Symmetry: D3
Subunit: 150 residues, 6 copies
């Protein structure tokens, strides 16, 4: 279904380096629809819930500290296979190993400063979307673009 959604967030570094517009544009050009958007400074609880999967890792503390150190631009994009697609457009965890053309590939050089976050699954996406946004903050009316889908 062309109604799948994923949660994307331009991290503090991405926001501080002026890459918000660059990132949003890449997703608009791709053909995905922005159904949620807002800037906020993540709280400690939000950070830890968002990254609950890593709470046991040694870098968890620093991860939470950094994600809450400055503004973050939270977004929700909609479209067929958007979750996996958005991840492909991002690259891989280590920006140095991310291919040119991908977001991390073009702008990052450190895993601890990898510019952006993207849901890794539909299940994670639904959970993350519900975590960062309120229902009222998400569009309900999209309208399929006949130029993007058959």
């Amino acid at each position: 279904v062309n109604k799948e959604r994923t949660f994307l967030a331009v991290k503090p570094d991405g926001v501080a380096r002026g890459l918000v517009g660059e990132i949003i544009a890449r997703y608009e050009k791709k053909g995905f629809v922005l159904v949620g958007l807002k800037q906020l400074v993540p709280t400690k609880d939000l950070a830890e819930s968002h990254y609950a999967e890593h709470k046991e890792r040694p870098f968890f503390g620093g991860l939470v500290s950094f994600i809450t150190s400055g503004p973050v631009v939270a977004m929700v994009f909609e479209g067929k296979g958007v979750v996996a697609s958005a991840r492909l457009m991002i690259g891989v965890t280590n920006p140095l190993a991310s291919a040119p053309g991908s977001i991390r590939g073009d702008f990052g050089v450190d895993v601890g400063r990898n510019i952006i976050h993207g849901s890794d699954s539909v299940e994670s996406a639904n959970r993350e979307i519900a975590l960062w946004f309120k229902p009222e903050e998400l569009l309900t009316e999209v309208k399929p673009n006949p130029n993007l889908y058959e």
Copy 2:
């Protein structure tokens, strides 16, 4: 003052044409800092308050009906002379008469669909910011690139 703020809104036509990222990026590259950002579908009340100065004018109903016809990306930028600078970057009311390099000059062809709105003055800016954003949705700690201001 380097902390002046201005309200900018990518109107329905701008959002539908996928110009949100492009516009945000132009202001980021300029050196202005994003202090507020969100997508919403303006309520009729909000719209009427926004265009209040035109309530007695014939086209009032039209402006209100359009800005509420679909999603709008609202934002607030901060930096020296941002109010005047932001509109210079936009061009003039008529995108056809706007010079290449400006937003309307590069992307618009109809004054009735001129893509974006920028506060016409500091006074209107302060008024629109308080109207479109709640205090908690605006950064309190800014600090732009240290290479921007003397």
Copy 3:
């Protein structure tokens, strides 16, 4: 009316320098619709007709020889006030005096190699279009982006 049309031609220098896509892209982003397009090496007669207004001036011979010296990308764009707008987007006769953001301003340095030609008025355009394209090479069904016009 939003049905106005203008004739644009990327001259031998613009083509040789790889500016075809760049130019076409600017008009597409502006919102104008491509209603005609083709690459050709102009004939002596085609050229003499195109510059017919200068048939008496000494430089006439030069203009004819250059435009027929290599491939040219001829095109027709449609939209409100496209004629005047196209020229504004191109810049002024002398690229050195053309403002940054305009085509000549960004890519030209010589009046004799000014990259592109744009009709100077609606009557010159209708004449130029009929001269360079056969009616069957021009679209009759336009239907541009619905977010461009009020």
Copy 4:
């Protein structure tokens, strides 16, 4: 041989989305020479021959119907290994599986609306070029750029 040629076509969805210039530019920047170019609305017979390899498949009718539903920008590019290079620049059949940096990777989201067509082999290229372009519409004078080739 640097005289190799491939047939490329921006299908109706690519034209409708204003991606003609962007695509043309990519190939120009790559170093391939444009030897043929024109916009036209393909006819049913041209389309069926073009998609001959699929005449026995159920999606044949749809492919034919779509490519003939609106304007298409047909082009021919010349250069060393242009056929395979052009496809690599396009990405893969499914835009969602196409890597960022490629045309489909950056702008497509559905196999049925994958923006562009490119010859899959030299045999197909020669066959397609002959189908879409008359000999008169193709340059005979190319002239290799010393900066591009050894």
Copy 5:
């Protein structure tokens, strides 16, 4: 003459903000030829000589301090009317008052951090070039693209 040259320098703020490539590319795209290029940390004597015309002003000391506060990318471009053209491409002293499309108009917000320096006349250009570059650091043979000059 098309042999005219000008002296351009990306000041410490421009280098610090990652605008070196962007700037060089604008002049390259314009058609001007790079005849001298190098990054260095200007000494006080170089700085004071460069700004000799302001030697008896209150802002002098400040200009000398900043231009010597970090790496600068000094360069020399050659082409017809390059001096005036380069200035036009830069904008005006005050970036906020610089039109969109110009370097300062697109990237600056403070007159004290206006990104780049450009010679204001052939006289000063010939002086600045000799001040910043040694003979052996400048190309002797240029001969630019024949598609740029008639």
Copy 6:
């Protein structure tokens, strides 16, 4: 360490095709810091020392003649795993097989004119750096950008 450095050279073909700024900008956007830069016409001595590993191979003379055929823009970038990273951003030896998004992938069509050179290892980078630059021409301290590194 985040102080690793690599040598990059925009060879004669890259400079001639006006790709200097485009390439510099790619590395700047990536987060790598320019610690050395200058344009020069390599002497035969420098060229042979640069390509020393192939002195006894058939193609040695060719590589030497070409890199000394015109101006070259030599540079040194610094950052975590910059050596390996810069090569990933370059693509592969054969530009035709280089993926879209990489430098050679987006701009080259011939192995003999593959635009740029990047050190293949840390050992060779250090060798090349000392070969092309004098210590005085390289920045000493850089200080890690808090936005780029942990």
